């Protein structure tokens, strides 16, 4: 993807931080799933 961003001529640092924020996006979506499962009890839940 670094070289792909270079093929797209934009600097790969921008694509790298886009990628990292995308990781953060699905991570927050997974936190949302944690809230779909436990709601808010996951702050004290064992697995939570």
């Amino acid at each position: 993807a670094c070289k792909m961003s270079h093929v797209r001529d934009l600097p790969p640092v921008s694509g790298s931080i886009i990628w990292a924020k995308q990781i953060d996006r699905q991570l927050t979506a997974y936190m949302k799933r944690v809230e779909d499962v436990l709601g808010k009890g996951w702050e004290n839940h064992v697995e939570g």
Binding site: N44, V46, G48
Partner: protein
């Protein structure tokens, strides 16, 4: 407490008497079959028989027949 919330108390309160005497539990037992009728032994006897559900906290009633601490009891 619940199975996992060790920070949030499920039902935490007290069972204190009217005056300033420090209520010292002595081998207190849970209600037999969770009928809420639990007993609390004390050092001068002082069987604190009380209920759990509703507004029946604190000290419901008591009875003494001796002055020793009840270190063994069994609600049955």
């Amino acid at each position: 407490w619940s199975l996992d919330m060790l920070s949030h108390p499920q039902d935490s309160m007290e069972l204190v008497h009217k005056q300033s005497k420090a209520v010292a539990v002595t081998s207190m037992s849970f209600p037999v079959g969770d009928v809420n009728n639990f007993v609390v032994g004390s050092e001068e006897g002082s069987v604190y028989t009380a209920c759990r559900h509703g507004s029946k906290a604190g000290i419901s009633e008591m009875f003494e027949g001796h002055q020793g601490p009840i270190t063994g009891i069994h609600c049955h």
